[PDB]
Amino acid sequence: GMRRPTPTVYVGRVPIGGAHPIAVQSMTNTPTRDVEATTAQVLELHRAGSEIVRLTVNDEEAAKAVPEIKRRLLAEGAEVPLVGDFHFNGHLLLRKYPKMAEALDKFRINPGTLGRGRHKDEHFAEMIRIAMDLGKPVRIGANWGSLDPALLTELMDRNARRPEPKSAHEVVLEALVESAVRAYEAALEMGLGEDKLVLSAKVSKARDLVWVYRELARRTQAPLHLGLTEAGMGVKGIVASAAALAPLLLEGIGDTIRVSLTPAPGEPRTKEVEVAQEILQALGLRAFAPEVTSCPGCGRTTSTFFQELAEEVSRRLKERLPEWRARYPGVEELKVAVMGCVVNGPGESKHAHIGISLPGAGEEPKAPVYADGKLLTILKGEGIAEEFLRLVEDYVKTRFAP
Amino acid sequence: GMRRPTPTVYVGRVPIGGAHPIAVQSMTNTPTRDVEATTAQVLELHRAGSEIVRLTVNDEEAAKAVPEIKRRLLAEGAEVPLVGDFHFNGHLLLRKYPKMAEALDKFRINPGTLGRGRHKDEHFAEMIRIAMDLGKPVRIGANWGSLDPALLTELMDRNARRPEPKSAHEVVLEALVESAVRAYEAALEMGLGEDKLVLSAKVSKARDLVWVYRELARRTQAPLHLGLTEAGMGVKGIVASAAALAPLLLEGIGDTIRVSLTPAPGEPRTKEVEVAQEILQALGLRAFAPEVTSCPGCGRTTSTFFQELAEEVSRRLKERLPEWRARYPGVEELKVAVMGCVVNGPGESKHAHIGISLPGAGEEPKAPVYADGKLLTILKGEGIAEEFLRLVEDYVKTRFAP
Ligand SMILES: C[C+](CO)[C@H](O)COP(=O)(O)OP(=O)(O)O
Ligand SMILES: C[C+](CO)[C@H](O)COP(=O)(O)OP(=O)(O)O
Ligand code: SF4
Ligand code: SF4
The missing domain is CATH 3.20.20.20 (Dihydropteroate synthase-like)
Incomplete structure (x- = not known):
């Protein structure tokens, strides 16, 4: 433009x-x-x-x-x-x-x-x-x-x-x-x-x-x-x-x-x-700060965990920013996705720098994580939130290294 | 358009x-x-x-x-x-x-x-x-x-x-x-x-x-x-x-x-x-509902009354809408102004259907009210808020009468 x-x-x-x-x-x-x-x-x-x-x-x-x-x-x-x-x-x-x-x-x-x-x-x-x-x-x-x-x-x-x-x-x-x-x-x-x-x-x-x-x-x-x-x-x-x-x-x-x-x-x-x-x-x-892209959730969304996870990711990113801004030049451009089911989850996640697609209705209880447009890992069980946030931190350290 | x-x-x-x-x-x-x-x-x-x-x-x-x-x-x-x-x-x-x-x-x-x-x-x-x-x-x-x-x-x-x-x-x-x-x-x-x-x-x-x-x-x-x-x-x-x-x-x-x-x-x-x-x-x-136009307030603004008044007017308009929508066809188009001082107060108020300009710093303690682009009255003392809201009600009854 x-x-x-x-x-x-x-x-x-x-x-x-x-x-x-x-x-x-x-x-x-x-x-x-x-x-x-x-x-x-x-x-x-x-x-x-x-x-x-x-x-x-x-x-x-x-x-x-x-x-x-x-x-x-x-x-x-x-x-x-x-x-x-x-x-x-x-x-x-x-x-x-x-x-x-x-x-x-x-x-x-x-x-x-x-x-x-x-x-x-x-x-x-x-x-x-x-x-x-x-x-x-x-x-x-x-x-x-x-x-x-x-x-x-x-x-x-x-x-x-x-x-x-x-x-x-x-x-x-x-x-x-x-x-x-x-x-x-x-x-x-x-x-x-x-x-x-x-x-x-x-x-x-x-x-x-x-x-x-x-x-x-x-x-x-x-x-x-x-x-x-x-x-x-x-x-x-x-x-x-x-x-x-x-x-x-x-x-x-x-x-x-x-x-x-x-x-x-x-x-x-x-x-x-x-x-x-x-x-x-x-x-x-x-670009001022990392942003989270997330779906609205719908009847395909499995529980209140989706809204909670999106909120937690946004909160953590805000907490880390002062430090990140100092150590990792360019991190203000970070795009993170948190998505509610397989319909748009993988695709939107592959457009972000890093994103997670939760399992929605009818799906196996596993959550693929994508980074730089490809599969990074698949998460399961308790502590999905803390695992994903570690993966985001790891991503930032490598991608926005000086 | x-x-x-x-x-x-x-x-x-x-x-x-x-x-x-x-x-x-x-x-x-x-x-x-x-x-x-x-x-x-x-x-x-x-x-x-x-x-x-x-x-x-x-x-x-x-x-x-x-x-x-x-x-x-x-x-x-x-x-x-x-x-x-x-x-x-x-x-x-x-x-x-x-x-x-x-x-x-x-x-x-x-x-x-x-x-x-x-x-x-x-x-x-x-x-x-x-x-x-x-x-x-x-x-x-x-x-x-x-x-x-x-x-x-x-x-x-x-x-x-x-x-x-x-x-x-x-x-x-x-x-x-x-x-x-x-x-x-x-x-x-x-x-x-x-x-x-x-x-x-x-x-x-x-x-x-x-x-x-x-x-x-x-x-x-x-x-x-x-x-x-x-x-x-x-x-x-x-x-x-x-x-x-x-x-x-x-x-x-x-x-x-x-x-x-x-x-x-x-x-x-x-x-x-x-x-x-x-x-x-x-x-x-x-047009779905009346709207309030209000300045941001600045150091010319006299007290917290301005923010309180703007909020109260918005709240009252929301409370009246169900009834008004039934009685007064077209009321969804109502524009009300609440302004903080003389700099933009009268002018913005004259662009609304009805508006009030509070006195800011250096001004006499009186608040002109405008309707249909001209002076309607001048308010003073306690109860400015309740007086103005009565004037807005009166305005609606006449302007949006069936
Ligand atoms: C509901 C749906 C299916 O594509 C979405 O994931 C998100 O809702 P949306 O943002 O309104 O987009 P769609 O119209 O649904 O594509
Ligand atoms: C500060 C001022 C003087 O015209 C205003 O009333 C409102 O602030 P504003 O919306 O930024 O508009 P101005 O730049 O101030 O005209
Ligand atoms: S991605 Fe899935 S859960 Fe999210 S709004 Fe779309 S269809 Fe619903
Ligand atoms: S109208 Fe007056 S009080 Fe309101 S922002 Fe402008 S200058 Fe400040």
Whole structure:
């Protein structure tokens, strides 16, 4: 599959663009002024796999905290880049708090939260000037929840002159794209480099997101920050996010992703990082950790042992990963199968690196194990689970040896 | 978006094809011979939204149970169609147990589990003959876990003659498609109607599934049963399934879906139905229930109240749905927003049918509510949650009145 070529934008030490792995990012939900809480959550998110972390810089007390948060991160060798999220008063905060401006690795601007009418262009120019002075990259990030009303009215009037006007909904999507593209072009014209500009234009419906990003990809050369905004809670948020991103990622569009989940009360903020990683890995774009392929089970499946075994294998693989990642380069690509009966068991197992096919209904009580597409052994009796996990360990040591 | 046109195939009373809603299906995991357990699970799945339910018919005792399961379903007015899943001995079971053959609403055949060499064609013909005699529809369902080895060798040899041979992996995908297409054409040639044939060709990797179904859609006219086989457990299974199906559904390919999740020990079998519904609804293809759009929350968000409120609104909407579905036609389309601050709160709320924007950091402690894109009221104090839910109820009564 062919990735859209783009210039490289470094966000701290992390390169993003068409020549680089698609980067996972996230955002904190602690008050930025709370240095201890925010530092801890940045570290938690980074350790979960957030390669870039965003934090809101909403007021003066937030701005004053940012240099200390960065200092603390660096003191433990955590080189995770920080993106500051600015709305309404970004120009004032960046002007008044130069140490915050220098401590951030990237500024996020929203062309719909710059101020009204004439103030907009001036506030934009000031934030871009500061970024240029400090050599910082910028994301120009549009969101349909904060669309520039003057631009919307301009495009509504253009639409009304068409021989067949489009729907109001379609015009909103046009305006969102136009907001991002106009601001991109303005920033380039002011002298901000192509190696310093990332774009997003987010909406909260999957089919609309696909249209928007196809337009952005066509009309601009910038790396794109992709996400389905306001995806919501639980299973709904997870599914909507994956459904929205996949068609675009498969087409080669997108250079960094963020998954916008609402945590349930007491649910960890790291869930969104896990989902982002799973999207990229599902599409074969990155490898973060070994994966288990398993059938759903059906009436052919002999007992609850199948579900238990699949769960145990997944759990063990998670426990071994920190060590394996250190010793066995490439192990993140490991595919393990655990299957319920002979119908698909051998075949699916032979497509994995290693897999086991349990005996289902009507079969002799033995479980063949396949590795690299051929029979490795046949297991029987008690301790199938512990035997198989030993065989997986043995496999990893040989296949992913340095 | 434009749906691929196809003939209509009735599965019991449920029509599938390009002129009809994309149908959600599932499969039982109880032993089919256990009439009480299987009947109960069929009912559970149907009540969760499984429009078609599949059950394995693996042996003689399974076959003998099917008529009683169907009888019990019909006794409670549950007209849910049953698909029988046959492997290895389907021809023997359908021949020996005509009451099972008549009680099923559809037969699933796997061209890779028919038997070896010469036996294959005969077993296929017999199952198709029985379907034709009884006026039953058939799914010819290929799976890469049970690929016909003779066909694979044929295509491996064709590939080896190419000036630039493809990879072994690519040949497997070619063979999977060819298996389904050849069997489709054979069944048509035997006289099975176009209104009696559904096709699937499942693989366990998302990008490969997209290639396969694009080929099936091009080379055949049949309605397509789409699924990512062996998607696995937990978040991984959910994300992979959504990621695989979305690009195809957005392109108009697919007439019925099944989500192939491995339940965790003690996790309900209905989870896969919930995920299938969420995929279709995320893509705007079906509406099953009201949805809540909510931001992730960030450091602008004032307290834990935001996450609590979003959760409470979602919970209330789920509680009201059975009643609402009866009284208020079209309510399944309801979009509700719950947002954390002024940045995107008003704008996202104005895109929903009704939404609330909480006050975040720096804002006065008041929460505007929007409905049909304009200000409805402004809430303050305690009981915001109960006030908003009353306003949502009031909205539904007026907007979705019969
Ligand atoms: C953080 C923010 C400002 O527009 C949001 O409200 C939601 O976060 P998000 O879904 O990642 O979308 P943004 O990048 O923030 O537009
Ligand atoms: C049931 C079956 C027979 O091929 C499977 O093993 C898995 O179920 P599935 O993922 O829905 O795939 P199938 O339609 O069954 O091929
Ligand atoms: S591999 Fe066997 S046990 Fe697993 S779902 Fe398929 S037919 Fe059922
Ligand atoms: S709407 Fe406000 S509270 Fe919600 S994530 Fe966005 S900026 Fe943060």
